[PDB]
Ligand binder design. Structure first.
Ligand SMILES: C[C@@H]1c2ccc(OC[C@H](C)c3ccccc3)cc2C(=O)N1CCOC(=O)NCc1cccc(-c2c[nH]cn2)c1
Lengths: 214, 214
């Protein structure tokens, strides 16, 4: 997205959370046209802030919006269970275009936080002899169930061939997901290493694997 | 107040489908500020139409929007699997109001069945060093999105320590899931092999991995 939002935020009932929406001087910074939207997954979204700070009728004053330079911010005070949702920002542009942020998943903690176990697997013997070199990054035992994954070929980001599953709650009531990177045998063998970067609750873990002689 | 959309619509591959969005004279019928969004479950939405009929760059011209009186309509020609999603309409009204429809689930009927690709990964060296031996059975590219998984230690059923993620649709419009088996290094080294057996629509794919010899 052209506007940048943090992937996730969280707080316990009664706490406050602030989420940011960063653009450039030609969008967020160029006018007072920032809006915020709330969506409970699967249901219609709702406009909750317009013109940076204005609440539509029925939106409680626990929601407030502000802007400083090229960054707008939404604050939710006294978190309530109904505030657990996805939040998006938008801003008009210079060419009367419209820019959206990528969305922030806001969790009202329903259980203790849990950092993910991250395990990165290199290509298996069987798939290599089948001319495939898929890497798997296993992410388990985390809460809230929101994670963002990035891959790097050596030091360069790689977006092609990346797939990540939607987190699902497992039998221990914590979430699991897997990110897999479909490489050719040539790609795998011709790089010094590949890395899986897992971000959860604003904290990042990195794992790396490299080809071996056996 | 919400705008009125049918809860569901459908069509076959290559066919067309039209879905409607009915508002009032002071929103949909009041100006040319009608928008349409496409959203796959668990993902951020994508604006596909603005100002009744305009497509953002990169949106296929198979999507077309029109408006008559109080009712806007989206038409998707040449339906593709990727078009199976929720579709929302929106319209600005007076008083800086932004109205949203309740959403239409568009189903693309009779999508092709696809058996899963299964790749079984043995424990990585890093985790065997940290006294862990998780195995991951990666299951991808299958449709419809339901599988069952069974594990074997040698030829015997594994009855504990298994987790399987809820399948999720990926960028190829087919489903992916992971099943992971938590073992200790001692369990991994004692047995001759471990096997993952994936059942999809009555057919079973089995993979086997054994302690390496490197
Ligand atoms: C990922 C991001 C995104 C996030 C949120 C979201 O809706 C949130 C709403 C509340 C919503 C709707 C439906 C369900 C839930 C939430 C849409 C998008 C989008 O599409 N995204 C991808 C980046 O592309 C853009 O920013 N394009 C915006 C665009 C492009 C070109 C022209 C115009 C234009 C001109 N003039 C008026 N409009 C606009």
């Amino acid at each position: 997205s052209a506007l940048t939002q943090p992937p996730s935020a969280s707080g316990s009932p009664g706490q406050s959370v602030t989420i940011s929406c960063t653009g450039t001087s030609s969008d967020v910074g160029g006018s007072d046209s920032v809006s915020w939207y709330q969506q409970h997954p699967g249901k219609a979204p709702k406009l909750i802030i317009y013109e940076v700070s204005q609440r539509p009728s029925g939106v409680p004053n626990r929601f407030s919006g502000s802007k400083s330079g090229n960054t707008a911010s939404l604050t939710v005070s006294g978190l309530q269970a109904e505030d657990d949702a996805d939040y998006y920002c938008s801003s008009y542009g210079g060419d009367n275009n419209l820019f959206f942020g990528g969305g922030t998943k806001v969790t009202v903690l329903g259980q203790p936080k849990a950092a993910p176990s991250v395990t990165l697997f290199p290509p298996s013997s069987e798939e290599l002899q089948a001319n495939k070199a898929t890497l798997v990054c296993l992410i388990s035992d985390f809460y809230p169930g929101a994670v963002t994954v990035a891959w790097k070929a050596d030091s360069s980001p790689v977006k092609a061939g990346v797939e990540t599953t939607t987190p699902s709650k497992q039998s221990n009531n914590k979430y699991a997901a897997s990110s897999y990177l479909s490489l050719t045998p040539e790609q795998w063998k011709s790089h010094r290493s590949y890395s899986c970067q897992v971000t959860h609750e604003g904290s990042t873990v990195e794992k790396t694997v490299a080809p071996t002689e056996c």
